[PDB]
Design a binder for this molecule. Structure first.
Ligand SMILES: [Mn+2]
Ligand SMILES: [Mn+2]
Ligand SMILES: [Mn+2]
Length: 90
């Protein structure tokens, strides 16, 4: 995983949000979190091959802090529909 992505993961706040792993400007995975910190840190110790892939293929990680879990739910759904990320279940 790119050092800058590890750094961003370790700096992520204990706040609700949506996260987007990207490669060459294209989202490859979009997820939500009740706490960005907790969820993103799970990528550092990959529990599945897909999680390993997402973290190795990405060249960028974007995070969006949201108002609350309801916003996270709908923002995530909308972004997945918009971008159809390669690692999103279809
Ligand atoms: Mn999700
Ligand atoms: Mn960007
Ligand atoms: Mn709420």
């Amino acid at each position: 995983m790119k050092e800058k992505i590890r750094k961003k993961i370790l700096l992520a706040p204990e706040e609700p949000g949506v996260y987007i792993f990207k490669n060459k400007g294209v989202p490859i995975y979009i997820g939500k979190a009740k706490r960005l910190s907790n969820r993103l840190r799970s990528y550092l110790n990959p529990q599945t091959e897909k999680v390993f892939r997402i973290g190795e293929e990405a060249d960028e990680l974007e995070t969006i802090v949201v108002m609350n879990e309801r916003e996270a739910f709908i923002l995530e759904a909308n972004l997945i529909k918009k971008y159809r990320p390669k690692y999103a279940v279809r």
